[PDB]
Amino acid sequence: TTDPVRMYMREMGTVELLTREGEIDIAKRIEDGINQVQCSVAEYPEAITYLLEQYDRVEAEEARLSDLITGFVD
């Protein structure tokens, strides 16, 4: 009908609104998804040794604490 305003309202109106329980459903999957990739990163030897070579650069005054970690879980 042209008028891109119209073809949006109608394109989004198809997506059905989430139930209060449904929000957590999708959100749980997110946690699962990321946690999968986190563990997958933990399983790489170069990922460790690289982090080692990076922290040795932090202690060598070749970087800053802000450029490597955002803080630990604990």
Q: What residue ranges bind another protein (CB under 8 A)?
A: 2-4, 7-8, 11-12, 15
CA dist., res. 9 & res. 28, Å (int): 29
Compute the least distance from the CB of residue 33 to another protein, in Å. 13
Q: Which is nearer to another protein, 29 or 57 (CB)?
A: 29
Compute the least distance from the CB of residue 5 to another protein, in Å. 9
CA dist., res. 37 & res. 73, Å (int): 16
Q: Which is nearer to another protein, 4 or 71 (CB)?
A: 4
Q: Which is nearer to another protein, 8 or 44 (CB)?
A: 8
Contacts by 22-26 with C-beta closer than 8 Å and gap 24+? none
Evaluate whether 7 touches 1 at the Cβ level (below 8 Å).
yes
